[PDB]
Amino acid sequence: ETVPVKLKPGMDGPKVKQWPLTEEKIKALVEICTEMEKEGKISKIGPENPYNTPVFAIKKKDSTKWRKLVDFRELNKRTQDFWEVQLGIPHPAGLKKKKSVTVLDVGDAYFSVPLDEDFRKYTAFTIPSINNETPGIRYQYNVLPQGWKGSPAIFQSSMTKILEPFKKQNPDIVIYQYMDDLYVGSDLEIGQHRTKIEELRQHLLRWGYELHPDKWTVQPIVLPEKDSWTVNDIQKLVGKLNWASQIYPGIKVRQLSKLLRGTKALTEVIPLTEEAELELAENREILKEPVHGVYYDPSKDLIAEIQKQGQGQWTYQIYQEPFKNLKTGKYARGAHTNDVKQLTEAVQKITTESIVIWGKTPKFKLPIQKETWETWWTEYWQATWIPEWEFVNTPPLVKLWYQ
Amino acid sequence: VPISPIETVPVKLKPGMDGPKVKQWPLTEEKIKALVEICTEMEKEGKISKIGPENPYNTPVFAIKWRKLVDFRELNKRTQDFWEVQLGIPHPAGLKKKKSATVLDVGDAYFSVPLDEDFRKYTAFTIPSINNETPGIRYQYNVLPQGWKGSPAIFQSSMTKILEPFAAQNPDIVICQYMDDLYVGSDLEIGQHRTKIEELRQHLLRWGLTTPDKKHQKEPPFLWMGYELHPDKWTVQPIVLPEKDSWTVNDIQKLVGKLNWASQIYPGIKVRQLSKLLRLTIPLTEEAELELAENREILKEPVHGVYYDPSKDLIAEIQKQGQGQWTYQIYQEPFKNLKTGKYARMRGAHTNDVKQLTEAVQKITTESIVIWGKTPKFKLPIQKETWETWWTEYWQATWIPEWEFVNTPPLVKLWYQLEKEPIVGAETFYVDGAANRETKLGKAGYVTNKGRQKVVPLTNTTNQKTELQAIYLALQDSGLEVNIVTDSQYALGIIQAQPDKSESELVNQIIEQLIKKEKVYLAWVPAHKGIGGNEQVDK
Ligand SMILES: N#Cc1cc2c(Oc3ccc(F)cc3OCCn3ccc(=O)[nH]c3=O)cc(F)cn2c1
Numbered sequence: 058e059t060v061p062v063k064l065k066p067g068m069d070g071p072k073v074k075q076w077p078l079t080e081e082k083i084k085a086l087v088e089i090c091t092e093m094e095k096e097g098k099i100s101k102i103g104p105e106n107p108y109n110t111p112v113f114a115i116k117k118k119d120s121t122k123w124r125k126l127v128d129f130r131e132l133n134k135r136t137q138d139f140w141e142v143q144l145g146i147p148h149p150a151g152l153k154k155k156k157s158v159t160v161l162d163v164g165d166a167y168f169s170v171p172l173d174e175d176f177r178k179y180t181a182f183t184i185p186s187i188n189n190e191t192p193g194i195r196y197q198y199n200v201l202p203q204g205w206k207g208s209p210a211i212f213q214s215s216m217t218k219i220l221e222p223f224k225k226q227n228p229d230i231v232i233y234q235y236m237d238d239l240y241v242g243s244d245l246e247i248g249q250h251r252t253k254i255e256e257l258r259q260h261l262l263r264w265g266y267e268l269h270p271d272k273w274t275v276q277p278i279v280l281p282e283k284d285s286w287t288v289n290d291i292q293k294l295v296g297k298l299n300w301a302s303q304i305y306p307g308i309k310v311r312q313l314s315k316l317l318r319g320t321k322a323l324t325e326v327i328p329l330t331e332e333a334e335l336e337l338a339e340n341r342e343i344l345k346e347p348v349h350g351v352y353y354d355p356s357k358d359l360i361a362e363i364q365k366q367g368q369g370q371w372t373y374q375i376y377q378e379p380f381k382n383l384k385t386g387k388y389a390r391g392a393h394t395n396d397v398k399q400l401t402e403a404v405q406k407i408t409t410e411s412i413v414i415w416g417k418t419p420k421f422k423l424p425i426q427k428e429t430w431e432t433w434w435t436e437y438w439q440a441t442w443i444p445e446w447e448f449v450n451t452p453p454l455v456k457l458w459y460q
Numbered sequence: 461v462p463i464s465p466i467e468t469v470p471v472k473l474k475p476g477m478d479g480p481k482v483k484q485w486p487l488t489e490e491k492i493k494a495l496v497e498i499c500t501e502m503e504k505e506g507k508i509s510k511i512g513p514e515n516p517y518n519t520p521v522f523a524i525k526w527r528k529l530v531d532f533r534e535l536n537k538r539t540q541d542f543w544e545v546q547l548g549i550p551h552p553a554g555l556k557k558k559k560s561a562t563v564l565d566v567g568d569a570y571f572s573v574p575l576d577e578d579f580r581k582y583t584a585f586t587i588p589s590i591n592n593e594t595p596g597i598r599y600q601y602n603v604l605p606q607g608w609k610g611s612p613a614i615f616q617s618s619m620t621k622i623l624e625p626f627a628a629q630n631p632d633i634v635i636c637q638y639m640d641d642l643y644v645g646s647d648l649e650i651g652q653h654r655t656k657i658e659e660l661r662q663h664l665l666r667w668g669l670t671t672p673d674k675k676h677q678k679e680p681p682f683l684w685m686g687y688e689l690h691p692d693k694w695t696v697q698p699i700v701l702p703e704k705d706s707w708t709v710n711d712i713q714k715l716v717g718k719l720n721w722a723s724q725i726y727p728g729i730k731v732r733q734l735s736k737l738l739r740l741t742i743p744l745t746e747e748a749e750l751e752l753a754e755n756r757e758i759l760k761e762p763v764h765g766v767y768y769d770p771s772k773d774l775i776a777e778i779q780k781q782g783q784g785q786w787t788y789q790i791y792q793e794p795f796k797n798l799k800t801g802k803y804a805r806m807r808g809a810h811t812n813d814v815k816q817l818t819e820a821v822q823k824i825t826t827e828s829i830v831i832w833g834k835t836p837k838f839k840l841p842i843q844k845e846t847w848e849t850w851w852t853e854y855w856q857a858t859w860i861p862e863w864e865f866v867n868t869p870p871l872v873k874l875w876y877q878l879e880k881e882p883i884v885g886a887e888t889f890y891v892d893g894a895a896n897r898e899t900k901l902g903k904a905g906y907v908t909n910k911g912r913q914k915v916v917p918l919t920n921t922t923n924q925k926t927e928l929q930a931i932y933l934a935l936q937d938s939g940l941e942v943n944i945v946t947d948s949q950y951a952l953g954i955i956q957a958q959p960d961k962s963e964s965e966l967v968n969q970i971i972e973q974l975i976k977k978e979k980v981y982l983a984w985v986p987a988h989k990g991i992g993g994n995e996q997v998d999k
């Protein structure tokens with residue numbers, strides 16, 4: 058019944074070091090893995106298996122029971138992209154437009170399908186031991202594992218037959234699957250949507266998290282409206298307009314700069330000439346129109362930049378080509394005392410939105426030190442997938458302009 | 461009588477690789493006679509067996525002249541990569557004190573575990589005959605060969621399988637597995653402990669593993685992996701420092717590495733000036749001789765660490781040593797350390813005391829999770845209000861686990877803070893700088909709203925240095941409150957990063973100027989856009 062699978066040519070299996078875990082997380086992983094080997098989901102492996110993939114533990118959506126998360130990012134990249142072939146699932150464009158969408162965890166269904174006998178060695182993971190007092194327990198996955206790229210692709214065949222009645226019974230509801238998460242969109246009332254969600258929940262039991270895409274697209278660039286302007290006010294305005302002039306062609310700053318002529322005090326009020334007031338209006342209407350020639354390219358990578366704005370506010374932009382933002386937004390929100398828990402929640406929200414809009418996760422650029430982020434991000438992660446990221450170490454000047 | 465046979469681990473060679481085929485180098489007549497005797501007894505024991513002429517693989521054999529040495533260096537180059545045995549060694553401070561603890565080193569350990577039958581062909585070796593007038597006697601290993609790449613990893617996996625049932629059925633005992641040795645500890649009465657030890661030795665004999673007897677078992681103080689383990693405390697083995705020679709670069713590993721090794725229990729150990737020298741081949745700066753003088757004073761009295769007590773809280777306290785050096789102690793009760801350590805500043809052009817403190821916390825946090833499985837409570841030399849002002853206004857996201865302020869100076873402080881809004885009543889300095897890359901000549905200066913001006917000519921400079929110099933001029937020639945307008949994105953990136961010390965001498969002068977001000981507002985404008993104050997013409 059198994060489906061064959063093999064890595065891409067010229068790529069060996071994953072050999073990723075397991076990072077240290079706290080004692081409470083090691084206990085949770087021991088209890089979980091003891092039950093899984095009894096259920097046949099995993100089996101202990103010997104030393105002939107050099108491959109390893111890290112594993113940690115979280116709690117999802119304020120649920121007491123711990124969940125096991127495996128960072129299959131290396132394996133997924135080394136897993137055949139062709140494992141997606143036959144292209145896995147297409148991305149439905151109607152999912153982003155639906156008034157309401159709900160996400161469910163369908164990962165428990167993946168465990169019923171068996172994994173190929175050859176590929177099991179690549180799903181090897183190690184439960185670590187405190188102080189290296191004893192060798193770590195090593196298992197391998199006999200069944201399809203959650204977080205893998207192939208597991209949704211393989212089950213997509215069964216998934217279509219499992220949900221074929223609910224689809225035919227409810228044609229307006231849209232259904233999408235990314236990793237172990239299933240995204241179902243509706244236009245009905247939230248209470249009706251939630252009760253109607255239990256209809257799909259019952260269907261899943263027989264065979265074996267509310268967001269609303271009312272965000273309203275890329276947020277516009279906005280210039281102040283003042284009756285009196287200081288030298289500092291106009292200096293910030295020209296700097297912002299000169300910045301937006303890389304994104305918008307017609308921006309002109311010559312007439313506003315003429316008001317700043319001479320060496321004046323920053324807090325001195327400058328009356329606006331009619332020519333300059335005209336230039337400000339011509340620039341507003343330019344900013345009211347959309348960005349020119351901005352398209353999505355499924356071959357290219359999505360990039361997500363985040364800027365800490367202070368007081369719980371965070372701004373982000375998604376783009377493939379710089380100055381061609383496919384989406385911009387702000388996250389005001391968490392933990393007011395913890396910057397890192399805020400950023401982690403922000404990274405998850407952005408990734409969730411990016412799955413709904415394009416069906417793939419972006420590569421993040423985080424305003425945080427690598428060593429600080431690597432130490433704490435697992436303590437606040439509540440998602441079943443993991444995106445890629447890098448670390449911005451130079452303060453972006455554009456932080457003010459997105460504020 | 462049942463021996464409970466050990467199951468072999470399936471072993472293969474690397475893909476696209478064949479077995480080793482090496483020359484049997486000539487041996488003297490005594491060495492040949494010596495290897496015959498050993499192989500006969502080893503073959504009698506079953507560890508090896510004579511092979512026919514069919515085997516096409518060969519690994520060399522030498523004699524060192526009553527000891528056999530089979531060099532599998534080629535087979536190791538071609539055997540598959542085995543799973544890594546636990547790379548780290550257990551740290552003594554993570555150990556929990558037990559009423560008794562017993563060390564058991566398994567003897568003839570690798571030879572007690574068999575080898576995969578399909579791989580025994582690759583372990584072939586030929587003992588040359590005398591005078592080369594007889595075909596050499598060929599042998600193959602039937603057990604884990606000493607020196608083979610997979611012998612350690614296969615032995616560990618086999619040992620862990622055997623130990624699992626005994627451990628589950630004897631919860632009162634705690635077993636630690638490390639290479640060829642097993643360390644058992646219990647809180648039982650000394651009589652029941654020794655009886656349980658004999659049970660484990662019988663279990664290992666059931667599977668064919670030899671153990672030391674009660675009189676042969678070593679007793680504390682144990683000398684293990686460089687430490688000295690005692691029933692109630694722990695320390696490193698006595699320090700070793702080479703005085704010879706008075707001028708030598710051999711201290712590139714000896715002096716610093718041993719001071720690094722002693723840093724886990726000896727607090728206040730510094731290695732910065734001595735590690736600077738490295739920068740098979742040296743002078744000693746006067747600052748490095750003062751480091752060893754304070755080090756030798758720390759190394760004068762022997763110190764000991766305690767064992768971990770899970771019932772008490774885990775505390776970590778950090779101190780600033782100076783020049784990017786940090787020292788920390790981890791303890792549960794006052795004046796009794798579990799371990800100590802140090803943190804070295806990462807190399808950078810501009811740094812901050814608050815940033816270094818955060819990196820030290822993260823470092824200690826990761827070390828503690830490894831050793832004890834939890835994050836310690838921190839006692840830090842920084843005021844609570846300082847951390848709030850820093851983290852709320854920093855452009856990056858930063859976090860420190862639960863901590864409390866300890867007032868042991870030098871306290872970490874913020875040395876300057878820029879205004880978020882322009883200052884009313886303060887002079888507005890428009891600064892600019894430029895240089896010619898061909899001549900390395902440039903100018904820096906400012907113009908203000910009060911009519912104050914200055915332009916300074918400079919030699920051997922760049923555009924980025926002139927733009928920093930112009931800000932420095934504005935700071936020097938301004939009152940206690942000043943507004944500064946620059947077009948230098950490079951200068952803004954340095955100051956918005958908020959350094960307290962820098963590698964550039966010019967930035968440190970700017971820092972020293974900022975510290976003397978009451979309020980500084982730094983504003984940025986685009987260059988060459990017609991802003992009236994930007995006097996790029998003056999350069
Ligand atoms: N040589 C050597 C050797 C022995 C051990 C080792 O022994 C222990 C085993 C189990 C246990 F529950 C505690 C143990 O030691 C606790 C601290 N301790 C030490 C000595 C003593 O006399 N009393 C005492 O409490 C553990 C380990 F990780 C590495 N080891 C190397």
Ligand SMILES: [Mg+2]
Binds near residue numbers: 893987
């Ligand atoms: Mg300039």
